[PDB]
Symmetry: C3
Subunit: 146 residues, 3 copies
Amino acid sequence: SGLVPRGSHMSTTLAIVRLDPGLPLPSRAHDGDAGVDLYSAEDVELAPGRRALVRTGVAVAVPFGMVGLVHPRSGLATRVGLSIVNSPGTIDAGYRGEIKVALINLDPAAPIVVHRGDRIAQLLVQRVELVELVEVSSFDEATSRG
Amino acid sequence: SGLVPRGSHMSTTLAIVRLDPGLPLPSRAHDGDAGVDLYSAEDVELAPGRRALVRTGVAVAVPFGMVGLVHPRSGLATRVGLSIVNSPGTIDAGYRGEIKVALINLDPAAPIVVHRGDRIAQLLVQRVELVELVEVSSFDEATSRG
Amino acid sequence: SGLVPRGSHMSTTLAIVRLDPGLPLPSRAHDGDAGVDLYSAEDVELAPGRRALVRTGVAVAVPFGMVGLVHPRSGLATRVGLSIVNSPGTIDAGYRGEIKVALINLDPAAPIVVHRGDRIAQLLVQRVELVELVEVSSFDEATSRG
Ligand SMILES: O=c1ccn([C@H]2C[C@H](O)[C@@H](COP(=O)(O)NP(=O)(O)OP(=O)(O)O)O2)c(=O)[nH]1
Ligand SMILES: O=c1ccn([C@H]2C[C@H](O)[C@@H](COP(=O)(O)NP(=O)(O)OP(=O)(O)O)O2)c(=O)[nH]1
Ligand SMILES: O=c1ccn([C@H]2C[C@H](O)[C@@H](COP(=O)(O)NP(=O)(O)OP(=O)(O)O)O2)c(=O)[nH]1
Ligand SMILES: [Mg+2]
Ligand SMILES: [Mg+2]
Ligand SMILES: [Mg+2]
């Protein structure tokens, strides 16, 4: 597998520092999966309605022209009401700090216990358009929907 | 319209199975819209704060190198506080099951009634970078923000 | 800076109307940032659990083949529990109205005060696949995960 297949020639490298090397490197659960799963570095208990800012133990260098996106996992979302307050979290190209996940318990009654080493979110990487705004007085000067 | 116009030459086909053929195929509400609207196959009532995992009656084959993304509709979000616990839901290229939507009622007091055949979310399809992680000891070895 | 550098040759213009010209044009907080920050045109107070549909004072013309995406800011999300009900908000290419943000207070006890001129969300622009659905009876006729 050190040979990059023709179909993966243009695939993107993401530099990562394991700030907590006791956690595995994030990985795709299955071939073709959009995201790599991020771990919790911490034990945390969330009562109903409470949030926390949870360390993942990693820092990344998203390439210029791209964005990292932190999305909730669907299983925990349905089973226990686990969500992310700022979802999708937006990780900028220039960020060199630790990725942190703003977990929240949206269940009305049952606490959520997160253990160190649990997979608590997924990180996608996508291209983004670094847009140049052009201010106009009206869209004329410059649709079905309107 | 069987002729693919020059400007749509590179547009992507998405194979879909209507597991519930009583529902219309998902469609864009207007030309240029980012997403196709997903239907509920089910009647569901959500008391304030409650969630459900709602069947959409479809399965798709997102192409390798892409991702499907399940987003809430803005009208229901404002009018009645309808949201999605794991938003944006992440549909992987390898998934061949039914798309399910984790609806939640974020209103404090009024129940939300969803009927079979209502449009309850929107599905976008985007390219994703299937990233190769490169572990480094520091970003040096390998920004304004820092 | 009127010269487009070789590396920004293909970067995208976004036409914008300041419907409220008392607010600054949205901008990236730092070079390489994925999104430009949207302002509130309004003063709004959100009690715990309450939502509002907040005017941003801008209208944009997202290019055909692209999507605008309204994401929460991470600082307010952690500090005070500020979220967006329909996050990520989906701004279609054909939309020429004012961008509105569906803010919600997910804190259990403390109200959130938003002032006119505060930065309350971020707007990304990305390509989207305008998909052509092909209905199949089974995926055969037309994976690790299954
Ligand atoms: O909104 C969604 C999100 C996911 N899904 C399906 C498709 C996706 O490929 C699959 C797995 O999604 P997640 O990775 O978000 N869930 P989780 O990590 O809990 O499960 P898995 O171990 O299967 O990855 O669940 C939906 O039907 N609706
Ligand atoms: O956060 C948002 C999301 C949408 N919008 C606008 C732009 C978008 O093109 C339009 C429709 O968004 P949705 O498709 O999410 N809403 P809905 O499906 O309820 O209405 P429609 O019938 O108009 O599609 O609403 C915002 O101003 N802010
Ligand atoms: O889920 C997240 C989101 C952001 N972040 C980090 C990386 C990102 O580049 C940085 C800033 O994100 P936001 O722009 O969403 N936050 P805010 O606008 O409050 O702060 P800033 O002034 O730094 O942009 O915070 C995370 O660690 N986790
Ligand atoms: Mg998963
Ligand atoms: Mg719509
Ligand atoms: Mg910011």
